[PDB]
Amino acid sequence: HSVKLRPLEREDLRYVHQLDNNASVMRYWFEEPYEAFVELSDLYDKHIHDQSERRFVVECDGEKAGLVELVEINHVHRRAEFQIIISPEYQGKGLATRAAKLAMDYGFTVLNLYKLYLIVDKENEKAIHIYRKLGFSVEGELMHEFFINGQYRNAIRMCIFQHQYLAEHK
Amino acid sequence: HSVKLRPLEREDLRYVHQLDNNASVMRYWFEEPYEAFVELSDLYDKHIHDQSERRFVVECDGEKAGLVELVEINHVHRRAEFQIIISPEYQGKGLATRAAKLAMDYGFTVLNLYKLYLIVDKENEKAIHIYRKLGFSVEGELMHEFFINGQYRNAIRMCIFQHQYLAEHK
Amino acid sequence: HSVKLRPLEREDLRYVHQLDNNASVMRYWFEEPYEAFVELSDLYDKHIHDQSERRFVVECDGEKAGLVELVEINHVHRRAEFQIIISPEYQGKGLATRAAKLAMDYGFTVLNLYKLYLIVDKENEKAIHIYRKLGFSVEGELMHEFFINGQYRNAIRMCIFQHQYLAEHK
Amino acid sequence: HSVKLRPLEREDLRYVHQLDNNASVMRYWFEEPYEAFVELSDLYDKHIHDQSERRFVVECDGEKAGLVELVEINHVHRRAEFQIIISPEYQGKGLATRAAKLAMDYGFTVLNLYKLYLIVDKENEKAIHIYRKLGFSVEGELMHEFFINGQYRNAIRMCIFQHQYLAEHK
Amino acid sequence: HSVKLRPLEREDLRYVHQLDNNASVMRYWFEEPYEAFVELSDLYDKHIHDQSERRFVVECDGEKAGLVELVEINHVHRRAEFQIIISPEYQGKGLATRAAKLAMDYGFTVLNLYKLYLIVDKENEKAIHIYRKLGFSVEGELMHEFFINGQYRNAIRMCIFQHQYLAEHK
Amino acid sequence: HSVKLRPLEREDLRYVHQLDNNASVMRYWFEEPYEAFVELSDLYDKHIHDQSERRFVVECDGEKAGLVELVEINHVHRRAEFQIIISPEYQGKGLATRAAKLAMDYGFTVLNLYKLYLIVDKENEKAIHIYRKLGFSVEGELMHEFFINGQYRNAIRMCIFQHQYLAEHK
Amino acid sequence: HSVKLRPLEREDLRYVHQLDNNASVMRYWFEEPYEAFVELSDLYDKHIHDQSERRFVVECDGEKAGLVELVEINHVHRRAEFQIIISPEYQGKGLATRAAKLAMDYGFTVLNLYKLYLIVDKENEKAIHIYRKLGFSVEGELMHEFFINGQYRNAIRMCIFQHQYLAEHK
Amino acid sequence: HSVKLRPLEREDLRYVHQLDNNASVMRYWFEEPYEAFVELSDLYDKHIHDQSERRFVVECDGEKAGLVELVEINHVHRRAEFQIIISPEYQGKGLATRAAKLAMDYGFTVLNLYKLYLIVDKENEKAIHIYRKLGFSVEGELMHEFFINGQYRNAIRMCIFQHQYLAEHK
Amino acid sequence: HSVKLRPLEREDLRYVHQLDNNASVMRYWFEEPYEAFVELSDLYDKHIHDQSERRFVVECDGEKAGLVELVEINHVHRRAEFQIIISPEYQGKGLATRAAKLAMDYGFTVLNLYKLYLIVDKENEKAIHIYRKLGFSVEGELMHEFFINGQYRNAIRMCIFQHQYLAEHK
Amino acid sequence: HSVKLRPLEREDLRYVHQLDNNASVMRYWFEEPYEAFVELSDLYDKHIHDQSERRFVVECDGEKAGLVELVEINHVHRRAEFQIIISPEYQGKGLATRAAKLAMDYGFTVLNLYKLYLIVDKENEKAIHIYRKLGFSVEGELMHEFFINGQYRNAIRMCIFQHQYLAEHK
Amino acid sequence: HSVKLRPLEREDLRYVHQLDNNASVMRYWFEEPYEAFVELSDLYDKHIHDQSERRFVVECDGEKAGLVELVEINHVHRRAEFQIIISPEYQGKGLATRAAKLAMDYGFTVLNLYKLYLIVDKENEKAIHIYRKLGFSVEGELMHEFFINGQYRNAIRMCIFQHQYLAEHK
Amino acid sequence: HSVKLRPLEREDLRYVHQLDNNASVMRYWFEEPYEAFVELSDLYDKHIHDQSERRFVVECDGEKAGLVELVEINHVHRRAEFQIIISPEYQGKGLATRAAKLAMDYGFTVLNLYKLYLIVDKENEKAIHIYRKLGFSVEGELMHEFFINGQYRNAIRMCIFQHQYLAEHK
């Protein structure tokens, strides 16, 4: 019932490593489902002081439940890309939505961003719902933007703005 | 009348430097018109072995006339982004068209890419016309994607595919 | 009720870690409430020989009750910024006031500072109460200095001088 | 009659080194008037990739006339601090006002900042006139912020906002 | 009988170590059968961010039964070399065939490869059997390519293409 | 009328940089025709002590006429791969044949290799003639090994052996 | 009853850290009473091979009792500064005197120094006694040489020479 | 007749080098008259960002005439030491007096120091007179503090305070 | 009864360290009988990627029994030096011979060497036997090639060739 | 009573540490009796590959009884310095004599030295006794070579040659 | 008529480079006639402090005429190897004889070596004669020790001892 | 007629390189006569900050005439070793004696040493005369200390003391 964000810590990397090798999950991020731990580790150390990203762990009643990240934070144009995952066992309990709100909250109320966008698979109508109902609207359809498990996929670019998130939950 | 592409060389940097500090030119690339030469020289050296990009100078009858760049070269998804600049005194001679073709030829016939794409200002009605001619179609309207010169702008994402290009200029 | 300052130690960083991710508390320091433990470590290591700061742990009967720091120590102009935090579980016991005067003592009678200054949220009445009983005057109001949790905030700049401190404490 | 900003280049550094040793001028930036060339040089190199500043040369008809800088560019809070020097022999010809707006134009239309601010000596009424004329409003008086040439000195913090500047210039 | 690929991990290297000193097995990879554990470690560390290879562990009911790898991944020409090994104690159970098709799957449907090729000993009939049932054609015979255990050996170069794989597996 | 091999020196590199950007020539080495001078330069330096290759310049009467290289020199298996370019303006005068035997002489009489091999485009019948004439025999046809100028291309692997070459030349 | 000197070891640093944070004790050395362990540690490693100092631990019957150091050992002018501390619990038992003798002994009989000097607070008549009775005589009174707990203090410079220590205890 | 102080520059080192190898000059600073240029060049580069010192060249009518140095700049205790040299051919023109004043002005009005001090030879009856004129009083007689030219010497420590100086040259 | 070779591992170095300090044993390798562990260790790490040597441990029924190394592996001239030791307690049981055969085997059947040579003490008629009976013949007598336990010793150079080892055991 | 030399090992350094702070013993090596364990470690590490020295532990029935060393090993002039120490608790048992001859053996029959020499305190009669029974002649008396514990000392330089050693020991 | 040896200098490298790429010369040293200048320059810098070798240029009447080298200088066993080259245009004037003598003089009278040795081609009947004259005797016939120019060669190892040389040219 | 010491500068090094290759001269310093310029150069750089030596050039009327050095400057024992060379063409004019006293003056009056010593060849009676004349007394005869030009040689150690030199020269 209670749902929070906290930073991805070094001691959380074992959890990330499992997700990042789950093809069913990684295909949603359009991420190649292959990661040796040492690669993960060496890249997390490399980005410690990278100010263009914030990676979070999602906790549902003190349990690790998924991942939210904000990436490509650009501060002159005031925008970033948003991306999220819920562990397979924590799925279908409302979490994506609750955790997406926390993210946007952080983008708009902490990072002082103007825009948030995301990319989703055209076929992922479940997720597109979540985002339409959150107030994201479609700004692009990228044809064949990704080759995933055997074929080209189309990607939907959705976004939402600061003044609109802020108006809607004030 | 004679127009080629060659790699951007150390000795070309000075010419790039003047362009990179031209607000009216740099607005086309959504690119902050500030650059100290030592920053350009450094980032050029940093990227020497960077396989994800190819930087070219456009030559017209042996004279330097602008710049083409394929960037974000992703070889799993077989795509790249392309950008182009014709220096102010060479504008009005058809060179951009000629350079796009040279660029498309490059990524399609040399790099074995499947998809090329570009980002233009929604208000750039000239260039947007030049690419529809060339086969590109619109795949997104990036809204307020860039803060340029005092206000946010919209960017048109336009793409073309290898099959299109190969089939056509056979 | 024994109260004293000691330097911030490596073995205290986990304690600092919790407070740095505590949004309620970070908001008043005007600090983004996000910190991975590895970021906090690297920075504390980076700063070990920085002579422009002094970070203390506040101890109450030996158990560790908050943080107080003098940063931006400039000895030519002989001034520093003061920041204090009392951990929630230790609030409302007269600790801030006490820690604050230990800090003021330290800056005035060890560092030989002429001027001590601080920045507070205009809405932070309990802190301002505490600073005025300590003797600080308001020198400035900084308009929209910080975007905190959804909106621009106003910052009060308060200060106090060596002769106003030394001529009160014998 | 013609006035421009360009970036501070490596080869402008001997011109900076002269001003930075000129005590009547440096007193207006609250800056100790002592700088070996090799110190300037090393600090310029250290900052080449520092995205928190932008240093410009002021040109008047193709001549080095002065310096304007935005520094402490903080992009979450969307502010920076502004400073300007006009060379003695180029003083009294109107250039401070020009380069100032040129620079404000930059912070507001290019860097997308929300607030620009500045510190002036309480007795430098010329400058204070120029900045008032230009839209800046007083927000603080830092008492005895700087010990300069033999005595403590009071600095006035003045600001301006994007909406104010953009309002007044489109 | 559950069978799957995961990346080669540091904690697997001891397992790799045994196989690399096993002459009977190394002979077919055309690999000198000598490896100190420190050589294997340094090289595995050296290669962590090499994107030209993917090394997998083959798992049978979770217990680790062999190795399969795609090396020389070239994405311009969109090809890679395939090598497989099934540990002795796990041979003759239909594991190679299965692992091999998981690898082919991976190269064809994740890496977006056009061509997969391998090199086998002409005398290695059980491997050639296995490759022909998988669909590979012989493209070359390499005369005296390797000196293995006392004499020059002949290598068969077999290959298979994306459209021959994708148009078999639905 | 006079023909020699000498080593590729640092000061021959601008001559190499021209050929390496000449697309009609580079297509015959299956090599992307794009090379900034600083990339060539850095890669030459990286390989100075690389004992796995030997690069030569072809001289004709004291003039740079072309390039011949042995690479992938593998000494346990006693083989290397051979490649040659003759400059366009020096073509059709018999030099390929000379430098080729000069180079083979080197692999066989100096480096003590057992096998020399080479890749040719299935349609480059000139070269194939030269290599047949010279003793090389076909051993493979790599189908669609290279995507070059717009299409996949077939490469013919040809070899020769020490005993064959030494037989035929003492 | 038995009293010796031994070198300050790494494993003694925890003891030094406590003294170095005791304001009552550090004020006698005119040393700012603030030291994070890591600073102490990083400075002790930095000075391991520094031939201009010798730091000792003072043992009273095998117990850690205080610190003696000889610093600024200059060997052309043949002198060094001497400084000492006795833990508060080991005070008033004769130790300062016994340990000062051991120090001088080391200066004069081991290091072959000509002069030893020390600095003490004008008010520290207890210590001045110890040193007058040891044969040190006053060579300076440095007015306001130190700012300590809230005000300027005068420092007494005392010294003694090799021939005189040696004559006196021979 | 015209006399200023400026920072010691790389290009000044040669002049310093000649002075630093003059026994009759260097005896004034208690300074071994040996220095290879490469040692001076190195120690100069080592100290570039050394905040505890400021080195000046004394100029008389644009010509280099000697050297001033504030060293041991301690900002907690607000003091520094000063030293001065007038090159042999400029002696007898009052320049040292003029340089001390320039130096005192520097540390008192720019550096905000509380106490300046210097060390002279007891036999230097000239200079010792020049500083009593200037306000300095004697605060120690350093006995046999330096071995110079065959015998130990006594040094007079002389000091002046900010209040004295400021009050006097107002 | 069963006898094998395996690579010298890091965890075998303690065993090597004992042999390498046994003067009776080291005198046979003409090696100075003195080795600190850290030297051994630092040299084994230094040579990990040295392709000119292979060091083996000799196991007799799973027990560490001696050392065989092949060194100075030269691949153009196709030869290497061979050297061997049997622990004193494992001596006189046939091991040298069995282990020498394994070595030669590796030289000739794995490393594809043409020649193997060795050096032995003229007096070591026991060992010379082993090698004559293995088919090694004498190619040199190096007079006074080594100073060993108190005097010059003559060394016998023996060798054997690939075709001859191979013929003899086929 | 078994007596032998082994090299000085890292795990012996604590044993060396005690002796290096033992003034009674250090005086005869003319060694300052001060050593922090970290200094001893760094230096032992620094010297690992120094081939100009050999440091031994002296073992008596396996338990470690002293130190013997050959330093300043010069092989052109074929000489070295000899130093020995027997730990107090192990003195007066004929150990020095024995260790000394093991060392002499080592230098003469392993290192192939022509000359061995040592330096002793003129007052060190028991050492001189021991060296004369070993066969060393006095070659020099060094006047006031060392200042040890309060006074200049006189050093005897003794030596012995390969032919005086080898023609005594058979 | 006048002939000396001097050290090989950086400025000599070019001359060495030409020799090192002369097959007919380099065959004498069993040395692959390939060398890029940058490799020679690098290996020269690598060996600057390499005590095991001395490289000389042979000068005849001030003109460079060839090269001598003492390598594998082993000072325990007191031996080295020597090699010599007379450049083609200086051959036939007795210079090699003269250079060997200069070389022998060097290792015997300067380096205190006991044994010098060299390796010649069995077919080099000239030089083999020159060294028998000089005192050298044959101590091995290295069979097929080098693969040169298409076939294996035999090398004659020849040596001379210090006593011989000293006794003779006294 | 005029004679000076100055420091050995970087630009005196070619003059040193000539003497260091002159065998008649170097034999008098017991120094192998072989030195590549780059070795001298690197060793000079390595020693720039080495406080244990001081190297001087001898000038005669503004000309390089020779070299004098103090080395092994040991300041606890207050000694150094002294060496001198006078150039051949500047020999026999009295300069050795001058530069010698100049140098002794330095060790005794500047560096405050207690003892200066020197090694001479037992047959260099010139020098021995000069040093006797000058105050030096014999203290040892090192038998067969150096193998120089073909034979062992005896060195005479001579010293002098500060009190002796200062006595004799004030």
CB I69 within 8 A of CB I56: yes
> Whole-angstrom Cα distance, residue H59 to residue H2?
8
Tokens of L159: 């010293």
Nearest to E127, CA basis, from E89, E162, E163, E157: E157
Minimal Cβ distance to E77: which of F78, F141, F146: F146
- Cα angle E100, E102, E107; round to 5: 95
- Contact criterion met (CB < 8 Å) for C147 and D76: yes
Contacts of residues J142-145 at CB distance under 8 Å and 24 or more positions apart, as own/partner, are J142/L139, J142/L140, J142/L157, J143/L115, J143/L139, J143/L159, J144/L114, J144/L115, J144/L161, J145/J30, J145/J119, J145/L77, J145/L79, J145/L115
Experimental method: X-ray
Residue K37 neighbours by CB under 8 Å, 6+ apart: F9, F10, K13, K14, K17
Instruction: Tell me if L17 sits within 8 A of L35, measured CB to CB.
Output: yes
Return the SS3 of C118.
Answer: strand
Distance (Å, rounded) from C-alpha A124 to C-alpha A63?
Answer: 26
**Partner-chain contact J143 L77, CB within 8 Å:** no
Cβ atoms of G90 and G19 within 8 Å: the answer is no
Cα–Cα distance measured from residue D161 to residue D150, given in angstroms and rounded to the nearest whole number: 35
In what helix (H) or strand (E) does residue I42 lie, and over which residues does it extend? helix I37-47
DSSP H or E stretch at residue F144 = strand F137-148
Q: What single-letter amino acid sits at J153?
A: R
Report DSSP letters for H118-157, one per residue: EEEETT-HHHHHHHHHHT-EEEEEEEEEEEETTEEEEEEE
The type of residue at E105 is: D
Question: What's the half-sphere exposure (Cβ side, CA atoms, 13 Å) at E106?
Answer: 28
Structural resolution in Å: 2.5
Indicate the helix (H) or strand (E) that contains L142.
strand L137-148
User: In this complex, do A34 and E108 lie within 8 Å of one another by their Cβ atoms?
Assistant: no
Residue in chain J nearest G10 by alpha carbon: J38
Report the gap between the CA of B15 and the closest CA in chain A (Å): 26
Cα–Cα dist J75/J60, whole Å: 30
Q: G16 pairs with which residues across the strands?
A: none
CB D140 within 8 A of CB D157: yes
Amino acid at L164: Q
Q: Is H90 helix (H, G, I), strand (E, B) or coil?
A: helix
Of the candidates B15, B44, B114, B131, the residue annotated as catalytic is B131
- DSSP secondary structure letters along I72-85: EEETTTTEEEEEEE
Two tokens, residue F141: 């046809």
Q: Do at least 3 CB pairs under 8 Å connect F with B? A: yes
The alpha carbon torsion through E40, E42, E44, E46 (nearest 10 deg) reads -150
Amino acid letter, residue L158: M
Give the span between the Cα atoms of G144 and H82, in whole angstroms.
17
> Is residue H124 classed exposed, middle or buried when 0-12, 13-18 and 19+ CB atoms within 10 A define those classes?
middle
Contacts of D48 in chain B (CB under 8 A): 36, 38-39, 42
CA J28 to centroid of chain Cα atoms: 10
3-state secondary structure of D44: helix
C103: tokens are 């800090």
The verdict on a CB contact (< 8 Å) between I45 and E38 is yes
Q: Touching H: which chains, 3+ CB pairs < 8 A? A: C, D, G, L
Q: Are A115 and B144 within 8 A, CB to CB?
A: yes
Question: Which residues sit opposite B83 in a β-bridge?
Answer: B69
Contact at CB, D140 and C140, closer than 8 angstroms = yes
Number of residues that this document lists for chain F: 170
Nearest-angstrom CA–CA distance, H61 and J104:
73
User: 3-class SS at D145?
Assistant: strand
Three-class SS state of F126: helix
Tell me the CA distances in angstroms from L33 to G55, L21, L30, L45, one per residue in order. Answer: 45, 5, 9, 20
Question: Cβ contact (<8 Å) for H9 and D38?
Answer: yes
Contact present, F32 and B110 (Cβ < 8 Å):
yes
Helix/strand/coil for G163: helix
Answer yes or no: do H159 and G147 touch at CB < 8 A: no
Of F6, F109, F110, the CB nearest to K21: F6
Q: Nearest Cβ partner of F7 from K36, K42, K149? A: K36
Q: Is there a contact between L88 and L65 (Cβ–Cβ < 8 Å)? A: no
- Residues in chain G with CB shorter than 8 Å from the CB of H157 are 140, 142
Which one, of I142, C159, E137, lies nearest residue D152 by Cα? C159
In a mutagenesis test of the D interface, which of C31, C115, C164 is the best target, namely the one with the most D β-carbons within 10 Å?
C115
| CATH code: domain of residue L32 | 3.40.630.30
Query: How many distinct structural domains can be found in chain D?
Result: 1
* Residue J16 vs residues H109, I84, J81: alpha-carbon distances, Å: 57, 36, 19
Q: Kindly give the interhelix angle for E13-20 and E37-47, rounded to the nearest 10 degrees.
A: 120
Catalytically annotated residues of G:
131
Rg (CA), chain B: 16
Contact K110 L42 (CB under 8 A): no
Task: Look up the domain containing F138 and give its range.
Answer: 1-170
The H or E element spanning position D26 is helix D23-26
Please state, in angstroms and rounded to a whole number, the distance separating the CA atoms of residues B125 and F22.
36
Breaks (C-N over 2.5 A) in chain I follow: none
| Cβ atoms of residues K145 and K122 within 8 Å | no
Q: Which two tokens stand for residue A46?
A: 């490399």
Chains E and A touch (3+ CB pairs under 8 A): yes
Residues of I within an 8 Å Cβ radius of E: 6-10, 45, 48-49, 54, 108-112, 166
Cα angle vertex K17, ends K14, K21, to 5°? 150
Which chain C residues have a beta carbon less than 8 Å from that of D141? 139-140
Shortest Cα distance from F28 to chain K (angstroms)?
26
Secondary structure of chain E as H, E, C letters? CCEEEEECCHHHHHHHHHHHCCHHHHHHHCCCCCCCHHHHHHHHHHHCCCCCCEEEEEEECCCCCEEEEEEEEECCCCEEEEEEEECHHHCCCCHHHHHHHHHHHHHHHCCCCCEEEEEEECCCHHHHHHHHHHCCEEEEEEEEEEEECCEEEEEEEEEEEHHHHHCCCC
DSSP sequence for chain B: --EEEEE--GGGHHHHHHHHT-HHHHGGGT--S---HHHHHHHHHHTTT-TT-EEEEEEETTEEEEEEEEEEEETTTTEEEEEEEE-GGGTTSSHHHHHHHHHHHIIIIIS--SEEEEEEETT-HHHHHHHHHHT-EEEEEEEEEEEETTEEEEEEEEEEEHHHHHHHT-
**SS3 label, residue G105:** helix
Residue E95 to chain I, least CA–CA distance (Å): 29
Transcribe chain K into DSSP letters.
Answer: --EEEEE--GGGHHHHHHHHT-HHHHGGGT--S---HHHHHHHHHHTTT-TT-EEEEEEETTEEEEEEEEEEEETTTTEEEEEEEE-GGGTTSSHHHHHHHHHHHIIIIIS--SEEEEEEETT-HHHHHHHHHHT-EEEEEEEEEEEETTEEEEEEEEEEEHHHHHHHT-
Q: Which residues pair with A25 in a beta bridge?
A: none
Contact I38, J48 (CB under 8 A): yes
C-alpha F119/C-alpha A119 separation (Å) is: 44
Host H or E run for residue G138: strand G137-148
The C-alpha angle with vertex K104 and arms to K103 and K109, in degrees rounded to 5, equals: 105
Q: Which 3 state secondary structure label does DSSP give J17?
A: helix
Q: Do L141 and J144 touch (CB under 8 A)?
A: no
Residue among B24, B30, B38, B40 with most chain D CBs within 10 A, to mutate: B38
Distance (Å) from the alpha carbon of I59 to chain E's nearest alpha carbon? 14
Contact flag F77-E145 (C-beta cutoff 8 Å): yes
Tokens of E78: 């969109």
Interface test with K, best of F112, F168, F169, F170 (most K CBs within 10 A): F112
- Parallel, antiparallel or unpaired: strands C79-86 and C115-121: parallel
In chain F, which residues have their Cβ closer than 8 Å to the Cβ of K34? 7, 54, 110
For L138, residues 6+ apart whose C-beta sits below 8 A from its C-beta are L156, L157, L158
Please answer whether residues A159 and A117 qualify as being in contact, where contact means their C-beta atoms are separated by less than 8 angstroms: yes
Tokens of L115: 């003892």
Spatial contact of I125 and I31, defined as CB atoms under 8 Å apart:
no
The angle subtended at Cα D93 by Cα D91 and Cα D94, nearest 5°, is 105
Chain A nearest CA to B147, separation (Å): 5
